[PDB]
Amino acid sequence: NAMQNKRDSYNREDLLASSQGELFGEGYPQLPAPNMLMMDRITKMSETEGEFGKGLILAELDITPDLWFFDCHFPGDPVMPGCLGLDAMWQLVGFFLGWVGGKGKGRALGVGEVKFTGQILPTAKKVTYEINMKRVVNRKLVMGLADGRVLVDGKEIYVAKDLKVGLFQDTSAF
Amino acid sequence: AMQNKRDSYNREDLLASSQGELFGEGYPQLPAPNMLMMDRITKMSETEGEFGKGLILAELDITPDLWFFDCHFPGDPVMPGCLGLDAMWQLVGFFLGWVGGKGKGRALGVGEVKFTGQILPTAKKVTYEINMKRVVNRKLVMGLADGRVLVDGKEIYVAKDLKVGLFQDTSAF
Numbered sequence: 613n614a615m616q617n618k619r620d621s622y623n624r625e626d627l628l629a630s631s632q633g634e635l636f637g638e639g640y641p642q643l644p645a646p647n648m649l650m651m652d653r654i655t656k657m658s659e660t661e662g663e664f665g666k667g668l669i670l671a672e673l674d675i676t677p678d679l680w681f682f683d684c685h686f687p688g689d690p691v692m693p694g695c696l697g698l699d700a701m702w703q704l705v706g707f708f709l710g711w712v713g714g715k716g717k718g719r720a721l722g723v724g725e726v727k728f729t730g731q732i733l734p735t736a737k738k739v740t741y742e743i744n745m746k747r748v749v750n751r752k753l754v755m756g757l758a759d760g761r762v763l764v765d766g767k768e769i770y771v772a773k774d775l776k777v778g779l780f781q782d783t784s785a786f
Numbered sequence: 787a788m789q790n791k792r793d794s795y796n797r798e799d800l801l802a803s804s805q806g807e808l809f810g811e812g813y814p815q816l817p818a819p820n821m822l823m824m825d826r827i828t829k830m831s832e833t834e835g836e837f838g839k840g841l842i843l844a845e846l847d848i849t850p851d852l853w854f855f856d857c858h859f860p861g862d863p864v865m866p867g868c869l870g871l872d873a874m875w876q877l878v879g880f881f882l883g884w885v886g887g888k889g890k891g892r893a894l895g896v897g898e899v900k901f902t903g904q905i906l907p908t909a910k911k912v913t914y915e916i917n918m919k920r921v922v923n924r925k926l927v928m929g930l931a932d933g934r935v936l937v938d939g940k941e942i943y944v945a946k947d948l949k950v951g952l953f954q955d956t957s958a959f
Contacts (some may be wrong), residue, residue: 688806702868727895731959
């Protein structure tokens with residue numbers, strides 16, 4: 613039952629293994645599988661770095677023209693849905709909760725304030741995510757709180773304050 | 787000049803919106819599947835709602851075959867909260883075109899969002915309620931609203947200060 617695969621970076625196959633419940637062991641939170649997975653790699657996981665000294669996650673998504681959301685959102689006007697970049701941030705906070713040893717199913721609990729000041733077009737190369745954990749609670753529930761930002765080819769475009777994700781052993785009555 | 791102005795819309799109408807054909811050229815578009823997050827709009831009003839500046843009621847029928855259940859998460863199906871949040875943004879943008887606003891829609895942000903429940907594939911129906919707070923008629927048309935999402939009678943998501951804009955040119959956005 614000892615946790616496996618704890619390290620400071622993860623590739624796409626690792627992310628898929630998370631989505632299948634295999635990366636860290638059994639019973640850890642899962643990333644989504646395609647087509648809800650919104651990252652290709654996690655380039656940095658740290659428990660003590662970041663703006664608050666309580667956790668830093670750096671991750672990125674390669675932008676290629678086959679990605680399903682461009683054609684439907686919107687026809688003749690392709691743009692990555694902001695909600696999916698927001699979800700990538702929730703996904704990363706949940707991933708951190710499992711990475712530090714938390715067990716259970718992840719559920720996003722909300723966010724304090726989100727501002728979108730730009731967009732992701734099919735012509736972009738890379739979307740990067742930066743998650744600055746504020747703190748993780750284990751008192752009663754298991755919950756992570758963070759601020760996050762999303763950049764497209766180096767330009768900040770989304771900023772989210774107080775991303776909140778919880779881990780739940782039983783979601784039947786959630 | 788505006789066609790198809792009425793107080794309710796069916797799924798065919800929503801598809802027409804996604805193609806830019808429901809209201810016509812220059813009006814904002816709903817997403818097409820698989821980003822479209824509702825089946826019907828049961829009420830559009832410019833005057834009703836908690837603030838007297840607009841009300842939108844819309845619905846999504848739940849089946850276990852909806853694409854997001856299998857991948858989110860494998861063995862633990864649950865509708866992504868971000869897609870119910872996006873449905874609310876979509877509806878605010880739809881209202882902006884419905885009242886005659888021109889331009890491409892972009893979500894601009896939200897204030898507090900709280901998720902206090904979930905949508906399982908065994909659920910029957912998700913209802914969206916949007917209470918418009920303000921429509922700002924400048925070159926950039928802006929809509930501000932509060933919204934909530936219910937599943938089978940249970941309030942599960944609550945979003946304050948949903949903000950959407952209609953852009954005459956997104957090339958520099």
